[PDB]
Enzyme design. Sequence first.
Site, PDB file in Angstrom:
ATOM      1  N   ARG A 181     -11.009 -10.700  -2.553  1.00 30.56           N
ATOM      2  CA  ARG A 181     -10.979  -9.282  -2.673  1.00 30.56           C
ATOM      3  C   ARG A 181     -11.506  -8.840  -4.046  1.00 30.56           C
ATOM      4  NH1 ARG A 181      -7.774  -7.587   1.779  1.00 30.56           N
ATOM      5  NH2 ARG A 181      -6.306  -9.193   2.413  1.00 30.56           N
ATOM      6  N   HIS A 204      -9.652   2.082  -4.190  1.00 29.37           N
ATOM      7  CA  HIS A 204      -8.803   1.079  -3.533  1.00 29.37           C
ATOM      8  C   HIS A 204      -7.336   1.404  -3.897  1.00 29.37           C
ATOM      9  CE1 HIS A 204     -12.319  -1.272  -2.722  1.00 29.37           C
ATOM     10  NE2 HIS A 204     -12.607  -1.273  -4.031  1.00 29.37           N
ATOM     11  N   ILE A 205      -6.407   1.533  -2.915  1.00 22.82           N
ATOM     12  CA  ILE A 205      -5.053   1.836  -3.197  1.00 22.82           C
ATOM     13  C   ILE A 205      -4.418   0.743  -4.062  1.00 22.82           C
ATOM     14  CG2 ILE A 205      -2.821   2.199  -2.013  1.00 22.82           C
ATOM     15  CD1 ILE A 205      -4.516   3.429   0.335  1.00 22.82           C
ATOM     16  N   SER A 206      -4.626  -0.509  -3.653  1.00 21.13           N
ATOM     17  CA  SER A 206      -4.087  -1.655  -4.375  1.00 21.13           C
ATOM     18  C   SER A 206      -5.019  -2.099  -5.489  1.00 21.13           C
ATOM     19  CB  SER A 206      -3.844  -2.745  -3.376  1.00 21.13           C
ATOM     20  OG  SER A 206      -4.981  -3.425  -2.867  1.00 21.13           O
ATOM     21  N   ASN A 221     -12.809   4.853   0.539  1.00 17.36           N
ATOM     22  CA  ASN A 221     -12.010   3.664   0.486  1.00 17.36           C
ATOM     23  C   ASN A 221     -12.527   2.813   1.624  1.00 17.36           C
ATOM     24  OD1 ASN A 221     -10.284   1.465   0.629  1.00 17.36           O
ATOM     25  ND2 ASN A 221      -8.393   2.752   0.426  1.00 17.36           N
ATOM     26  N   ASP A 275     -25.974  -0.190   1.555  1.00 19.85           N
ATOM     27  CA  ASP A 275     -27.268   0.330   1.914  1.00 19.85           C
ATOM     28  C   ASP A 275     -27.270   1.753   2.394  1.00 19.85           C
ATOM     29  OD1 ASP A 275     -29.032  -1.448   0.585  1.00 19.85           O
ATOM     30  OD2 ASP A 275     -29.019  -2.727   2.334  1.00 19.85           O
ATOM     31  N   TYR A 305       0.792  -1.221   0.000  1.00 22.64           N
ATOM     32  CA  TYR A 305       0.000   0.000   0.000  1.00 22.64           C
ATOM     33  C   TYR A 305       0.836   1.288   0.000  1.00 22.64           C
ATOM     34  CZ  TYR A 305      -3.548  -3.314   1.564  1.00 22.64           C
ATOM     35  OH  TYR A 305      -4.468  -4.374   1.715  1.00 22.64           O
ATOM     36  N   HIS A 313     -15.602  -5.690   0.879  1.00 24.88           N
ATOM     37  CA  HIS A 313     -15.921  -7.067   0.529  1.00 24.88           C
ATOM     38  C   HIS A 313     -17.032  -7.697   1.343  1.00 24.88           C
ATOM     39  CE1 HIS A 313     -12.356  -6.162  -1.606  1.00 24.88           C
ATOM     40  NE2 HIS A 313     -11.592  -6.144  -0.501  1.00 24.88           N
TER      41      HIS A 313
HETATM   42  O1  LIG Z   1     -36.680  -5.136   3.554  1.00 19.47           O
HETATM   43  C1  LIG Z   1     -36.030  -4.856   4.655  1.00 19.47           C
HETATM   44  O2  LIG Z   1     -36.562  -4.368   5.773  1.00 19.47           O
HETATM   45  C2  LIG Z   1     -34.621  -4.861   4.553  1.00 19.47           C
HETATM   46  C3  LIG Z   1     -34.029  -3.624   4.872  1.00 19.47           C
HETATM   47  C4  LIG Z   1     -32.708  -3.442   4.428  1.00 19.47           C
HETATM   48  O3  LIG Z   1     -32.074  -2.484   5.097  1.00 19.47           O
HETATM   49  C5  LIG Z   1     -31.996  -4.348   3.602  1.00 19.47           C
HETATM   50  O4  LIG Z   1     -30.718  -4.297   3.954  1.00 19.47           O
HETATM   51  C6  LIG Z   1     -32.489  -5.692   3.703  1.00 19.47           C
HETATM   52  O5  LIG Z   1     -32.012  -6.323   2.558  1.00 19.47           O
HETATM   53  C7  LIG Z   1     -33.916  -5.669   3.658  1.00 19.47           C
HETATM   54  O1  LIG Z   2      -6.495  -1.505  -1.662  1.00 16.80           O
HETATM   55  C1  LIG Z   2      -7.193  -1.009  -0.647  1.00 16.80           C
HETATM   56  O2  LIG Z   2      -6.928   0.210  -0.233  1.00 16.80           O
HETATM   57  C2  LIG Z   2      -7.798  -1.979   0.226  1.00 16.80           C
HETATM   58  C3  LIG Z   2      -7.518  -1.853   1.586  1.00 16.80           C
HETATM   59  C4  LIG Z   2      -7.709  -2.965   2.424  1.00 16.80           C
HETATM   60  O3  LIG Z   2      -7.554  -2.665   3.709  1.00 16.80           O
HETATM   61  C5  LIG Z   2      -8.113  -4.217   1.923  1.00 16.80           C
HETATM   62  O4  LIG Z   2      -8.867  -4.845   2.859  1.00 16.80           O
HETATM   63  C6  LIG Z   2      -8.833  -4.081   0.677  1.00 16.80           C
HETATM   64  O5  LIG Z   2      -8.928  -5.307   0.064  1.00 16.80           O
HETATM   65  C7  LIG Z   2      -8.086  -3.248  -0.292  1.00 16.80           C
END
Ligand SMILES: O=C(O)[C@@H]1C=C(O)[C@@H](O)[C@H](O)C1
Ligand SMILES: O=C(O)[C@@H]1C=C(O)[C@@H](O)[C@H](O)C1
Lengths: 149, 149, 149, 149, 149, 149, 149, 149, 149, 149, 149, 149
Positions: free
Chosen positions: A116, A105-107, A78, A91, A27, A84
């Site tokens: 990843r 993403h840095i990488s 980031n 949401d 990184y 992941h």
């Molecule tokens: O339908 C609901 O109350 C759900 C509400 C959300 O916040 C979603 O993340 C879920 O996927 C569904």
């Molecule tokens: O590349 C980035 O900045 C990401 C940074 C992390 O901390 C990882 O968990 C991600 O996979 C990648």
Amino acid sequence: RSLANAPIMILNGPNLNLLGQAQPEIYGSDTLADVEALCVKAAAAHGGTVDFRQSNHEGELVDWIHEARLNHCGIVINPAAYSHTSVAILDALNTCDGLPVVEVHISNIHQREPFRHHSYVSQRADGVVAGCGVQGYVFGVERIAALAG
Amino acid sequence: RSLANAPIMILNGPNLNLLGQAQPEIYGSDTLADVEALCVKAAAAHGGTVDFRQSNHEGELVDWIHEARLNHCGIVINPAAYSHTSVAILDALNTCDGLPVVEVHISNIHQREPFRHHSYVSQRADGVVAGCGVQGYVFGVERIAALAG
Amino acid sequence: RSLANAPIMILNGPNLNLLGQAQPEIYGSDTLADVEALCVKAAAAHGGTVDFRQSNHEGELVDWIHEARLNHCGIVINPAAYSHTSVAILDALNTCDGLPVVEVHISNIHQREPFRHHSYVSQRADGVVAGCGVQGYVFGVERIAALAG
Amino acid sequence: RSLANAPIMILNGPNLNLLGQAQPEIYGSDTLADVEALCVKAAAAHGGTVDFRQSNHEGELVDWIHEARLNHCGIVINPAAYSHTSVAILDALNTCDGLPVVEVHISNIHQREPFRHHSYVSQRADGVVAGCGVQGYVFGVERIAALAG
Amino acid sequence: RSLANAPIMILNGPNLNLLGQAQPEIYGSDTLADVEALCVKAAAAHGGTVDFRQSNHEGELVDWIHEARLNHCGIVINPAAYSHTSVAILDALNTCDGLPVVEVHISNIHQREPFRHHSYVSQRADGVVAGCGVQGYVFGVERIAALAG
Amino acid sequence: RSLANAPIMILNGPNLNLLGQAQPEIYGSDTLADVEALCVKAAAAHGGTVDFRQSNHEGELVDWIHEARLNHCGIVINPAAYSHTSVAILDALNTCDGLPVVEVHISNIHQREPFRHHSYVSQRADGVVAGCGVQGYVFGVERIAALAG
Amino acid sequence: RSLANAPIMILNGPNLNLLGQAQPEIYGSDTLADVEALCVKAAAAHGGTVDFRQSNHEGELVDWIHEARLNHCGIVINPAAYSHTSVAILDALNTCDGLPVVEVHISNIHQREPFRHHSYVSQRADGVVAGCGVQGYVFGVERIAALAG
Amino acid sequence: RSLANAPIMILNGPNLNLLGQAQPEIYGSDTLADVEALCVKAAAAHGGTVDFRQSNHEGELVDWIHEARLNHCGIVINPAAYSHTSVAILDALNTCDGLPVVEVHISNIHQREPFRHHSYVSQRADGVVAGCGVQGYVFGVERIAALAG
Amino acid sequence: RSLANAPIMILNGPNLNLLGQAQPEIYGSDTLADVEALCVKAAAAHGGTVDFRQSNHEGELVDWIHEARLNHCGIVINPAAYSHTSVAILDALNTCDGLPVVEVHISNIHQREPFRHHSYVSQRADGVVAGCGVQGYVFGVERIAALAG
Amino acid sequence: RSLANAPIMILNGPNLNLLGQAQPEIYGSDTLADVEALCVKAAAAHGGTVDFRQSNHEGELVDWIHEARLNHCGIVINPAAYSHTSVAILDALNTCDGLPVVEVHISNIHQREPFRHHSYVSQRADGVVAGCGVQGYVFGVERIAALAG
Amino acid sequence: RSLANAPIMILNGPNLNLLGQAQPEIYGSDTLADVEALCVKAAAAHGGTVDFRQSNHEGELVDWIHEARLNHCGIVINPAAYSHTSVAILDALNTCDGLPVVEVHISNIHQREPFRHHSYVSQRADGVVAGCGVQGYVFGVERIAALAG
Amino acid sequence: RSLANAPIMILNGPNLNLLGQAQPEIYGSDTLADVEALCVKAAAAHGGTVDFRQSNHEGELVDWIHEARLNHCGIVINPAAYSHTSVAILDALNTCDGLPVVEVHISNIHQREPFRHHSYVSQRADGVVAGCGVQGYVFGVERIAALAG
Ligand SMILES: O=C(O)[C@@H]1C=C(O)[C@@H](O)[C@H](O)C1
Ligand SMILES: O=C(O)[C@@H]1C=C(O)[C@@H](O)[C@H](O)C1
Ligand SMILES: O=C(O)[C@@H]1C=C(O)[C@@H](O)[C@H](O)C1
Ligand SMILES: O=C(O)[C@@H]1C=C(O)[C@@H](O)[C@H](O)C1
Ligand SMILES: O=C(O)[C@@H]1C=C(O)[C@@H](O)[C@H](O)C1
Ligand SMILES: O=C(O)[C@@H]1C=C(O)[C@@H](O)[C@H](O)C1
Ligand SMILES: O=C(O)[C@@H]1C=C(O)[C@@H](O)[C@H](O)C1
Ligand SMILES: O=C(O)[C@@H]1C=C(O)[C@@H](O)[C@H](O)C1
Ligand SMILES: O=C(O)[C@@H]1C=C(O)[C@@H](O)[C@H](O)C1
Ligand SMILES: O=C(O)[C@@H]1C=C(O)[C@@H](O)[C@H](O)C1
Ligand SMILES: O=C(O)[C@@H]1C=C(O)[C@@H](O)[C@H](O)C1
Ligand SMILES: O=C(O)[C@@H]1C=C(O)[C@@H](O)[C@H](O)C1
């Protein structure tokens, strides 16, 4: 909201507090403070400002997204590991109707382990930058500036 | 415990604070306060009370489920995004030997993206309601009432 | 660091605060306090000490790994449900260049549901112990005492 | 159409004729007739009526769905095994533009074998109830009452 | 049986005759004779004894498990490549009603190629120890001594 | 290699000839000629120059990559459809030992059909920009100038 | 229960009316009537009788299973194509608490297309016979005779 | 057989009785009676005749296929939902040694949900027409006319 | 060869030497000796004889198939765990051009863990009997008698 | 465009230059010249003309699609092996807003190897014809005439 | 070790004893003695010698691989069925640091059943030859000659 | 055709023009011209000749295969990247009824990334050589000499 009226929120996920100190071969050697300085300088050339934060907690990131929804002109994020795993961050970005979002993403995550290769954030982010080192945050600021303006 | 001796715990996961304000075409225009009122009313008709809470934090939710285990007559939960991701919430519920649990989702998750199809909570929940709008919390409370007897 | 110069970090994930009280048929009747004393005794035979801690919060676990990274001679971790879900904890462990790490599961996760079969922590941990009950934490301590030497 | 002008169709799939007599430890001891009485009572509270039917034949359920399309105010369905196998019932429901539909499963299918986790009907039904016993039919009726008003 | 009345069987699968001599960067520089001495020493601290064997034949390992079933107080087995392929060894272990069994892997299989992630033996073993070097055999013997009591 | 000494090769894949004329709601209304003028100005701001080309032929893009390998200071590539299908274009980029490469997709491929989610080119590209519209090309140029510096 | 008290239900699925006339190289040249006579004589050798039936209708087969549940001493069934698709027939046989059930396939399904390798009926059937020709029906009648006595 | 000596069997699966009335944006506004008249006209141009039928019942369709086997010169079939689910209709078609068979879908199934992408009937049909609207039925007749001749 | 001229080879795989003694709830209380007596009597009714063997070694099983290929009139095999893992045993049965082969499993493998559902032998076996208990062997003998005739 | 104003483009992919000379048991004995004649004759009955071409090169087929987009009234295409692999030809057809497009396969792909079951072109083509032989090209022409009219 | 100082180990897996006698349409009519003569001849042209062996037993194979490791210049192996199943034989070869290994399959396993497509040995063999008949053994020997050189 | 009457076609796919110059640690330091000289020499020993070509273009390779179909004694092909992607080149080779084809990969594809594990060419190629370096093309020439002889 325009860049002249509200800052760009710049969010950083878990373990990023150690940027420049841990795994420098993956990184880089620039720190999170160095990255905040780049961001400030890029936004100032467009007449904007930045609000730059880091958290290891999923729910705190959710709360900051909600804050940006009402107060900021866009979001550069980031999500780090949470890219992941967090449907909750996805949401939170989905409650932000029309707010410009750029994931960074840095990488190059596509060169690393298969866990990843997918990010939940990408399905909402208007743009996604990967493997452009900390320069990717600057690209994120420039894309928000073009979208907000 | 019975409904007469202890409140029903109503738990709400991430982003549910913005219910009624965000993505109304998916989740409707009633607010979380409106939902809390629906629950109070339905529990009242059974001689019961509710303890209604919302949190963005996975570990807070865990903590609240531990509290319920000892002090509440049952749990009605909308885990929101954590339904799809939280083995930790599932495991908290699994510590509650015999406590009635009803899972509620406002939207019909089976018509949405495939990552929304599966819930960890549903393997422990006694009952699962989906797509019945905010009326599904009313069903939740009614089902706790029947089971707590 | 060496066992004489710094304590062994002993980290416990979500719901393990209820150890001995819930699901005793799966996890036993010894409490987290009981485990802590086993650990204290095993470390004392090697001339070392332990810093024993539990949390239900993914981000607090991350922060305590970061603290270990600088101040402790190794980590014995029971990630509990986070073992299955947390890329963030794995990444935290990854920032700890060369620090001995031992993962422990009380139960034999390989005989349980298929979602418990994979752990993110196991790709970084030096050693993995499963299904040896609370005695697995003593194994963990013993292995860090060997690696630190 | 309204509940005052047309009955709610209640459809039950294969094997439900033996409700209360077979596998009582999974589906309960109340009979199909007992469920019909629950439905009649729930609808009468809203000034409505029900048309309750059961068949082991896929094509006969599709025929009944076509009839409801013209004469009924909504459909409460437990497709039973057909949930997991009938694209032809899903399609029949898809011809009923705008008719309220609620799918009901007496047991919690999400806790059973994996071939029971998926339902074709759930991609069209407005709401889906599972694991609420025969009380889930009463939920169904109340949800149609809300949607048909 | 008990550790005072019968030996602990210590079984080793294929290629472990070359331990210490081949692939030392993965498996270490201690030999199978060295591991035997560590086992003998650990059991004698509990007043027990061991019966230490190795074989490259799947059928022979099966026959030795049958022998243990009648004459030994428990089994510490390092199945080696057979962990991944041998349903017959799993089934032999399954005939041993209640006999304590601990599976040991010298290497952390979880960090290696995906074909090494799964082990048949792990669904019957009571405990599984991986990536704790030849010290995992001493953990194995200690666990058997705890269970056999 | 320096920007002063040789041009940046800008390679565009199949169908990009029609940019700005076809599917404007997905790829915008700027033309390929417009993108070429953006690239010339971006490189000029670093004292550099560009060699901008487009082709519908996979083997011709392979030949242009070999040319670049010897004569250019880096490659910005939008492989278009070939991103998803061309092992041959991945392999041509693999011949280019240490030459900076940045892959650009106008549209955010991660929001589109699942066959567009994976790119063979991303495994070799140093950096990958998606969903930043034609501005991505400018980012591409900037990253090459920083990597060539 | 006893063969003396009630006949063995022999049920045949879709297309079995054409046995001996269609695809003789896969299913042979004996007709369904020829199989019925074989089954009469096999049951007679044990003092029993048979009730032999064939239907192309899934629901009709469900109704005959419910009949059998009350009036027959066991079921031999060749579900034909419904073996691979009917959850409904599986469910009808699961209502038959303790009734002996034997499934028979004329052809060896494990040598044919992959969609024929799985049978829903085989998770309930006590025994399954495949690829033994029309002689498999005699085997089924002998197994029911052995289970009823 | 020949077209002069026997009719073409034209068969329609479940929900096709509503053609022209339901989901007109997907299947058109021509009715099943309009389709039949198209078919009659096309067959007459080759000196042939049709036998046009529709059914919601899988078993009936199987029975009609058995009839055709002996009495008709070929089969044009729109299996509708049973294209995806019926191994039984596939197997009926497989009893018809040499009989020309053409499968027709009004909609382009390949553009719809993934569950629609596979048809069991397509492995036996000689030709398959999809997405040609009701003219696809005319194509089916013409093809039966070239293959009978 | 015929039944009068050569014995029927009856092969048993690993762990079946403990039949009747281990896991009686799954495999019954009859011993391997009792199963050989069944086979001898069944063979004798057709004027044949049997050569009954068991081994834990996959290679020995291969050698005995080879021997049968030349000296026996058919093979009844219970491969036991090697059913699931031995391509070598499949391949030995493939060298046996035209020799009758029947595979037998005492238990109904289709009701047990998913790793037991697949058998390599069944793609070569003429017939496959599962879950008919030790009686499955007698059905094996009877099928070889009909095929060798 | 109408058929009177511009020709129908008829495009053929790789290896179709050998139609009628290679693998006749799969593709028939009519040549590509025969096919063009059939098409000219069918178009002429509707007052139209054709532009019939063949190419082994993916990029050339993309260029011809571009030509058609501006100059032709519709496209009939047999993509041959590019059906299965060309995202690039799929995207070329997507640039042709509202142009009628019908995909033709001479063989019935669904009966062949599983790599031939999916086509990228089919998600865009209006209609798909498979296994109607070279008569499917006439069906293609007929569909175009109906869609342009 | 050189060809002049030590023989090339030629290893042959299960069923190969029957080469030339069984399934000649797949493996040819040359015998194992024929193949040995071909190997002796090819080794002789390089001044070398061979040690040709065959075994049905996996562990014997492992044992011979360990002998070669210390006494032979290289291994030419046809693992036969064990190619697809034996992690133990792959791990035996992996103990041979730097010893040249070439894997040979007489038949082209890539045209056969999908379980034959994958070889464990192939991940360690330096070269892999398939489908070149018994001539592929000659190729093996020649490659060993070039690499020991 | 024999080797005396017609040349062997030696075809090389994309990026092979840089053999010996790029990635020498994977593909070696011998050039394509060195490979052609090894093939000329191998053929000459059998009284034959070679026709050695390279191209980056998929369709040009299809064209060359069509040539060989009529003018050459057999084909030795290193498809390179197109091995993994080209159904077109597979199909080209499928037009060559009875012509000897050998596929060669310099590097051992089974040890590399999983997208390199599968080849479309291998389902038609008579033989397949991998990981034997450039000596694999000499193997190729030798195998065509045997098959054409
Ligand atoms: O339908 C609901 O109350 C759900 C509400 C959300 O916040 C979603 O993340 C879920 O996927 C569904
Ligand atoms: O590349 C980035 O900045 C990401 C940074 C992390 O901390 C990882 O968990 C991600 O996979 C990648
Ligand atoms: O056995 C253990 O300690 C683990 C404890 C947890 O809480 C579970 O979530 C893990 O799955 C298993
Ligand atoms: O729970 C219900 O009512 C369902 C009843 C059935 O019969 C099953 O087939 C379903 O899977 C579940
Ligand atoms: O680590 C062990 O001891 C194991 C040793 C073996 O030989 C391998 O086959 C296993 O995969 C791992
Ligand atoms: O977004 C781009 O620029 C790419 C444009 C293409 O042509 C598509 O084929 C890709 O899928 C995406
Ligand atoms: O073998 C039998 O009897 C079966 C008969 C059928 O009709 C098929 O559908 C089954 O797949 C097999
Ligand atoms: O296109 C048709 O005619 C088909 C019609 C049906 O009714 C569907 O179920 C099919 O999926 C498609
Ligand atoms: O049922 C039988 O006889 C089988 C016997 C065994 O030993 C098992 O391994 C099989 O899985 C089943
Ligand atoms: O059926 C045909 O016209 C198709 C023609 C080809 O060349 C094959 O590649 C396709 O898979 C099938
Ligand atoms: O082609 C060979 O030599 C092989 C020979 C065997 O015996 C099979 O098991 C293999 O799958 C292939
Ligand atoms: O090893 C070879 O010669 C191959 C050469 C290529 O160019 C690769 O793309 C193939 O994957 C491998």
